[PDB]
Design a protein around this ligand. Structure first.
Ligand SMILES: CCn1nc(C(=O)N(C)Cc2nccs2)ccc1=O
Ligand SMILES: [Cl-]
Ligand SMILES: [Cl-]
Ligand SMILES: [Cl-]
Length: 163
């Protein structure tokens, strides 16, 4: 584990992370997809061998010795708000189990279900709060990756509020 486990946020491509493993915002079928998923596919294509897994779960596949944790958040266009909230919290709990099992000291993570799976709604607070609930009991350094300047400021403020 990390000496003083922390949360940090960076506004950059998660495929260029400086952490010991990455969480992919995956689709259930292990397809290359779009957004974070396509960048992850271009950087670690070997990690997509048998990576298909149900919504609400996470499945790790090694690219060399680098772990790619494929986490499948719900698509809010298909799920109700209630059932979608439950699957989003579950996907993060499965990421925490995988990070612990791997024994890594750090992990790069995106905000699940905030892009094309958002159902057209701003889900920054909802997704980030489920991320904290799952990762707070782990001792890995967590680095959250985003692409928007206003989202970087809001995520940074949410982390600082707790310290
Ligand atoms: C543009 C800032 N930003 N917005 C979202 C967002 O809110 N999504 C995609 C859902 C929406 N679609 C229309 C309106 S709200 C996700 C990440 C991000 O950085
Ligand atoms: Cl970048
Ligand atoms: Cl998404
Ligand atoms: Cl973003």
């Amino acid at each position: 584990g990390a000496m003083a486990p922390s949360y940090r946020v960076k506004r950059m491509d998660i495929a260029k992370n400086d952490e010991e493993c990455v969480v992919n915002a995956a689709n259930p079928r292990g397809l290359p997809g779009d957004g974070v998923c396509k960048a992850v596919y271009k950087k670690w294509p070997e990690s997509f061998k048998n990576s298909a897994t149900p919504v609400g779960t996470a499945k790790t596949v090694m690219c060399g010795t680098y772990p790619v944790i494929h986490a499948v958040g719900p698509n809010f266009s298909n799920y109700t708000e209630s059932e979608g909230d439950r699957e989003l919290a579950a996907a993060y709990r499965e990421v925490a189990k995988e990070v612990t099992r791997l024994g890594v000291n750090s992990v790069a993570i995106p905000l699940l279900s905030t892009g094309v799976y958002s159902g057209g709604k701003d889900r920054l607070t909802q997704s980030l709060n489920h991320l904290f609930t799952a990762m707070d009991s782990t001792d890995a350094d967590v680095v959250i990756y985003c692409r928007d300047k206003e989202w970087e400021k809001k995520i940074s403020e949410a982390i600082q509020m707790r310290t």
